[PDB]
Design a protein around this ligand. Structure first.
Ligand code: EKZ
Length: 167
């Protein structure tokens, strides 16, 4: 049993809810919250900007130190850092950004990072301002992630479309 409430069960291991991931993290304090990161860990907008704002910029300060030491992530790669006030850990995962012309085949590689964690609160990778089709992102998630993933979908209209169209 875990603390996640109000989710619709899509598969054995994938659950979905219309929720603000920031507000969900603050309530649950999951072991792992996933950030929709870029390779520079520049948390300007989208899910990353919202998560970072909720940490009072402490996520960005920590991220800048990481990049200064390690250099940029790979597209499809991830980095576990602090979860600050939101979670124990934040798994920063880089999905391909279609609005930068990145290979959508890298979305499966991105989701494979989730398999290193038994339970996660996450957004749909490469959705929103990363430009991919969220229906596609949900299909790759279900077909890739084997650990237990609780997906937060901010937009109610999109949530209802994801559920209604789910095979
Ligand atoms: C973030 C990222 C990484 C790798 C997997 C080396 C990119 C390591 C690490 O300790 C971290 O915090």
């Amino acid at each position: 049993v875990n603390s996640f409430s109000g989710y619709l069960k899509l598969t054995d291991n994938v659950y979905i809810k219309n929720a603000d991931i920031v507000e969900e993290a603050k309530k649950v304090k999951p072991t792992v919250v996933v950030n929709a990161a870029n390779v520079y860990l520049k948390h300007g907008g989208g899910v990353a900007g919202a998560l970072n704002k909720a940490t009072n910029n402490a996520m960005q300060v920590e991220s800048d130190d990481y990049i200064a030491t390690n250099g940029p992530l790979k597209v499809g790669g991830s980095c576990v850092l602090s979860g600050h006030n939101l979670a124990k850990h934040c798994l920063h995962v880089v999905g391909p950004n279609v609005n930068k012309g990145e290979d959508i085949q890298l979305l499966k590689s991105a989701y494979e990072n989730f398999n290193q964690h038994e339970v996660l609160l996450a957004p749909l990778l490469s959705a929103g301002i990363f430009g991919a089709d969220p229906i596609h992102s949900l299909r790759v998630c279900v077909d890739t992630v084997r650990t237990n993933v609780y997906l937060a979908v901010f937009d109610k209209n999109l949530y209802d479309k994801l559920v209604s169209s789910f095979l």
